Amino acid sequence: MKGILGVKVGMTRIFRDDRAVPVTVILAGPCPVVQRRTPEKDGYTAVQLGFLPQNPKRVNRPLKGHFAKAGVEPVRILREIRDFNPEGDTVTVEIFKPGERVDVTGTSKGRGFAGVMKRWNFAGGPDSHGAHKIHRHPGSIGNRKTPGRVYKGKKMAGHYGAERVTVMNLEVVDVIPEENLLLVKGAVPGPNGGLVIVRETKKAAK
Amino acid sequence: MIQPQTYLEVADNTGARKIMCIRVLKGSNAKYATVGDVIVASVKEAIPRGAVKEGDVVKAVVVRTKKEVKRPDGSAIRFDDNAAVIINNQLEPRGTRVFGPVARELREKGFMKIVSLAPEVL
Amino acid sequence: MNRGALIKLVESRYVRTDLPEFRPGDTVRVSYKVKEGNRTRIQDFEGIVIRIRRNGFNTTFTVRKVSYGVGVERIFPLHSPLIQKIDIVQRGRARRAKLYFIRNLSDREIRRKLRAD
Amino acid sequence: RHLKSGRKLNRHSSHRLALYRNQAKSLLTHGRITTTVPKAKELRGFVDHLIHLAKRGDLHARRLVLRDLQDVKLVRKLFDEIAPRYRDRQGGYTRVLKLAERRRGDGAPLALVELVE
Amino acid sequence: HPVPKKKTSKARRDARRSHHALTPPTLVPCPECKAMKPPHTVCPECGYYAGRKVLEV
RNA sequence: AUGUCGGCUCGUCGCAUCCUGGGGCUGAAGAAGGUCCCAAGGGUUGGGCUGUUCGCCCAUUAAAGCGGCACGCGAGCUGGGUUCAGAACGUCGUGAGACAGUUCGGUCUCUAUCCGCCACGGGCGCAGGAGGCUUGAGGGGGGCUCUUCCUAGUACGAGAGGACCGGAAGGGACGCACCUCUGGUUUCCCAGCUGUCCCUCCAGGGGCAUAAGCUGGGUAGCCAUGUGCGGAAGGGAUAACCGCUGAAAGCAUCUAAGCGGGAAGCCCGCCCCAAGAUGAGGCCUCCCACGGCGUCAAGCCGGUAAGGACCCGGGAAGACCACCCGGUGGAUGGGCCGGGGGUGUAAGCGCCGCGAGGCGUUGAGCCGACCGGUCCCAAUCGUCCGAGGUCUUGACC
RNA sequence: GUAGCGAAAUUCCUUGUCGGGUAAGUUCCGACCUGCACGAAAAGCGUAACGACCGGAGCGCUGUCUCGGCGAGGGACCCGG
């Protein structure tokens, strides 16, 4: 139930009759650089690692912190919980049989200090009936002397793009082992050329 | 496809080829309307004689001038907004209508009758 | 390499050649013929006769609206690759200026002017 | 909200074009220009284009650089003095070097453009 | 209008001013002459990266 | 000087619940109820009238809650009302005027120091120096629901009518994300057109006609009106209620013995932040115990690319800084090249037509970011801080 | 208190009743008289033309809104004075 990988695109396909809409995530086949066994940690968990960026461009602390079990020369070295790794190197020729289910998370597209009209989806002042401050500004945010404080958690202008985001249950319309491509009928967060890790959940009777 | 308050062609029996859509009718909260959704609606114009004066009658929207994206995956759209008037359950008062033949509307299942009924030319 | 390449792997698989029918134009009075199943699995064989009005490219295409005043106008984008389609026949020449979106039609329509184009 | 794109550039549309064509005249005359850095960056884009058409070599393309710079003495000056100096090389006809001394009273970093020789 | 309500101190004022301050500019020997030079722009005198392209008049 | 009704925008809270759940009782057959009890997690729409909260009134719906919160919220809005000056009607007054009697009018100043809030940093601590990867105390997000259909119109029924339980299938609202599709933008990407002035006279161009002249298109991007998911399943402890055993009341009794079931509620589960959690770091790798100066080598030092920073090239990261990837043992910008993808046949020449134009060379030309290639152009050469960020006790050689 | 007007730039009780409008009218229109406290030069009652008057419908068009999106400029942010 795993695979670290670089989201590539969002591109339609047709299906028998109805048409489906996969994104096309590559999954090259990372070298599990470190088991986290469990005597040593609570997790029991893999630390693997995808694409490879030239040998010299490297602090030697990774040269050997990567050398021990030894894969080769790469950077997207991230960790995930609960997955024995019989293989010396995962690949998804059979990590994922097509048509199962999958749970994807990858970093979201940025925004910079996007405003309140964004943030909480609603907002606005009415326009053109008077506004010293037209349309899109946050409304009042409290109440006099109930506390004299903004209630601590509440909505406000902020920064809404650099966040990690997941998308849970969604269909894997098809693996394709050759170029280690994978097709996941849906959205999948990210830029593209971007980064994503992939795992599982789906128990419910629905 | 959208219509909260609107005008809308009609041409069964009907007082016109025009009616007012009051509030649409599904799921309590509502907002919009696809074909096959019932839409209760007033009848802004009355054909002389005829059988629908100036009241309001429930009726199913057909066509929509809005790009509905099909499951077979393609999308009919036509420069018109035209309901058919309906009675009680889901029927037709008049048996005549002017619209293209075609489907989806039957896939709604509620009214296989209209799709049976709606001809060809125009 | 990269995403253009691999998506052309993936579409070489499905979207494939759309089965080679690659003759756009725009004047093109034309017959597309979609399947559309429905009642009793019946793959009734719908056949539409219409005026191409636009098309949009990029591997996946969409013959864009293909229009026809049945009496009311009805327009029909009709995904060019998809297997839904079966047979296609241009009946017009690929002539007449301005590429696509010819909205001359969507508004002032009328047999007479279209013939004037 | 803007995230991806390009051409991220200051002044004002029309007079942006005017700015470029203007400095382009300058550089294609004197052979080097000293300016604030961003102006230099975009200038190398645009001018590198114009010299490309300069080696493109014919009547049309000549009248297309005329579609820009609009000044026939500088046009032919370019068009026979320059092209041989690049009648081999592919792109990157320009050069840009940041200069030691930020300017008085306005504080811009400066820069030094000249097409390569 | 929504005016400040008071001074608060040499301290907190100097806190703000404190956190301002500024960096020394970078500088390197010139490969050629020497001097300082911002680490790579063509210096005013020894005057190049390679091939002079300045000066003399 | 404590800006007063009402609306917007944002709210959060309680329960004396409108619905959703869970249960007693019935003058409950079933279904629909009635009525009280436990229940605050979510939800409580769209309009007409009026300044209106209020109220009736249409359309429904699971419902269309009641209240707080300076009759929440004007250093955030509107100002319709009402409390200014102008004006008029009614009436009261001999008169100026007046009336919780109406009527039309009638400047809303609001650069933030502090708390609070949202994001983002700076120093620094974490008693060897740095480079990565994470658990999670803890905290937040989320928690909705209807409709048809199956067991079956079966139990119930004397028919019409019609279920519990338990399993699916569909949407509506809302939540989070994504460009493929549909769609919207695309201020200069393409073409057309009008005046005019100037390039050179005609042809072809340019500027100005809003900061795109105007009209048709439009990639990327950014987006909704589009697509995908999500609301749980499970488990624990539970409230009304239902018990099992069971005494003191040698029978009986759900009780302090002692155990059990029992909900959208609580906890965990799912997402997300988070060790400045001073109690993390925990793991891993290399640096080392570099060698330094009057030894408590916790000072001064190049050391130490171990690393790091400065500068640079940039960036679907972005105000700034941060983050991330590159520095010539490069493919990171810019360009050239190839595809894409926009427009929709370039000028030139020829020929046709009195002439506006047509036709052929012509799906041509031009081409912004799109996908790759290509050391042509630049990221040259570079200095700068950098070790004890750990101790006494306990094993242990 | 005559003719003329009346739920009225006058009527409180009040959204007075009836009818017209709208799916729905505390608004306006036409009547009713129950003129609290209209009325004849502080003028009554009409009236074509006219209004930067005030009220009420209807259409045409639209970001006023249903919910908003996007793009340019000018400020805002960063640097220097």
Swiss-Prot record, chain B:
Coiled-coil region list: none
A biological process term (GO) from this entry: translation
Molecular-function GO term, any one: structural constituent of ribosome
Keyword Ribonucleoprotein: yes
Function comment: Binds to 23S rRNA. Forms part of two intersubunit bridges in the 70S ribosome.
Family membership noted in the UniProt record: Belongs to the universal ribosomal protein uL14 family.
Protein name, per record: Large ribosomal subunit protein uL14
Highest classification ranks of the organism: Bacteria, Thermotogati, Deinococcota, Deinococci, Thermales
UniProt entry tagged with the keyword Ribosomal protein: yes
Keywords: Ribonucleoprotein, Ribosomal protein, RNA-binding, rRNA-binding
UniProtKB/Swiss-Prot annotation, chain C:
One Gene Ontology term of the molecular function aspect: structural constituent of ribosome
Taxonomy, superkingdom: Bacteria
Disulfide bonds: none
Keywords carried by this UniProt record: Ribonucleoprotein, Ribosomal protein, RNA-binding, rRNA-binding
Keyword RNA-binding: yes
GO cellular component, one term: cytosolic large ribosomal subunit
GO biological process: translation
Keyword RNA-binding: yes
Role according to the record: Contacts the 16S rRNA of the 30S subunit (part of bridge B6), connecting the 2 subunits.
Record text on subunit structure and interactions: Part of the 50S risobomal subunit. Contacts protein L14. Forms a bridge to the 30S subunit in the 70S ribosome, contacting the 16S rRNA.
Family: Belongs to the bacterial ribosomal protein bL19 family.
Name of the protein this chain belongs to: Large ribosomal subunit protein bL19
Taxonomic lineage: Bacteria, Thermotogati, Deinococcota, Deinococci, Thermales
Residues shown, of full length: 1 to 117 of 146
From Swiss-Prot, chain D:
Coiled-coil regions listed in the entry: none
Keywords, alphabetical: Ribonucleoprotein, Ribosomal protein
Highest rank taxon of the organism: Bacteria
Gene Ontology MF terms: structural constituent of ribosome
Keyword Ribonucleoprotein: yes
GO CC terms, sorted: cytosolic large ribosomal subunit
GO biological process entries: translation
Protein family according to the UniProt entry: Belongs to the bacterial ribosomal protein bL17 family.
Oligomer status and interactors: Part of the 50S ribosomal subunit. Contacts protein L32.
Descriptive protein name: Large ribosomal subunit protein bL17
Originating organism: Thermus thermophilus (strain ATCC 27634 / DSM 579 / HB8)
From Swiss-Prot, chain E:
NCBIfam families: rpmF_bact
Protein name as it appears in the record: Large ribosomal subunit protein bL32
GO biological process terms on file: translation
Keyword match Ribonucleoprotein: yes
GO cellular component, one term: large ribosomal subunit
Compositionally skewed regions (Basic residues) per UniProt: 1-20
GO MF, one example: structural constituent of ribosome
Region (Disordered): 1-27
A UniProt-annotated Pfam family: Ribosomal_L32p
Gene name in the database record: rpmF
Quaternary context: Part of the 50S ribosomal subunit.
Domain of life: Bacteria
Family designation: Belongs to the bacterial ribosomal protein bL32 family.
Signal sequence extent: none
Keyword field: Ribonucleoprotein, Ribosomal protein
Job of this protein: Found on the solvent side of the large subunit.
